[PDB]
Design a protein around this ligand. Structure first.
Ligand code: DRX
Length: 226
């Protein structure tokens, strides 16, 4: 999270830190959120051979009682997930056991929106991602306020699609989501509306976020069958 501020410890109880294991490389990390006691929503590109979820965290370098490290038994990537266009970058992770509901760990009900969030509206995204282009990932959960842009603002991303994704982050500001924040939720009015997906390597906003609403039907499908 570039140009943001350190969250008030555990003020975002649904946040999930993800350590991802791959075959030919060191572990990678991503964000995500707890939508069910045993289900975490995140970005499809964050998929791996195996994944470990850590809920209730703030400073990920220091283990505390609020911590709940859980085993992921199954990774559900969207069937149409495309690595070249980056469309449908959404994944559901089913947990081994259900997490415990604490002050530091809870779910973020994938809502019920009466109307789509009009650009111009400010929303917020949190994460443990890099805080700059050549900066490392943050030890503590960062948070920043970003403006929902008109789809035109994301035109340069040749494969960006309004129906499928959200354009987030005013280009006139440096604030934005960055490497590492992927999988985290974008919250507008307290309701999850997006998932950090991608942006320019040089960090110039806007950034591309998956439009959750659009996949609500696929999400309920996976849930209902597992
Ligand atoms: O590389 C990225 N995302 C990504 C990489 C490959 C993908 C392939 C197919 C679907 C979605 C994909 C998403 C992410 C990224 C690179 S620059 C940038 C700027 C702002 C955000 Cl919020 C994320 C990213 P990450 O380094 O994993 O945080």
């Amino acid at each position: 999270i570039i140009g943001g501020t350190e969250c008030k410890p555990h003020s975002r109880p649904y946040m999930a830190y993800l350590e991802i294991v791959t075959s030919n490389g060191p572990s990678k990390f991503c964000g995500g959120f707890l939508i069910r006691r045993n289900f975490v929503l995140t970005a499809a590109h964050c998929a791996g051979r195996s994944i470990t979820v850590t809920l209730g965290a703030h400073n990920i370098t220091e283990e505390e009682d609020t911590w709940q490290k859980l085993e992921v038994i199954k990774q559900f990537r969207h069937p149409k997930y495309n690595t070249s266009t980056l469309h449908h970058d959404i994944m559901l992770l089913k947990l081994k056991e259900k997490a415990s509901l604490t002050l530091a760990v809870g779910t973020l009900p994938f809502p019920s929106q009466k109307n789509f969030v009009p650009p111009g509206r400010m929303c917020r995204v949190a994460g443990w991602g890099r805080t700059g282009v050549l900066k490392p990932g943050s030890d503590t959960l960062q948070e920043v306020k970003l403006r929902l842009m008109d789809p035109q603002a994301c035109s340069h991303f040749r494969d960006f699609d309004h129906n499928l994704q959200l354009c987030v982050g005013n280009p006139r500001k440096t604030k934005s989501a960055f490497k590492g924040d992927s999988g985290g939720p974008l919250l507008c009015a307290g309701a999850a509306q997006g998932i950090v997906s991608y942006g320019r390597s040089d960090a110039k906003p806007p950034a591309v976020f998956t439009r959750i609403s659009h996949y609500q039907p696929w999400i309920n499908q996976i849930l209902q069958a597992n």
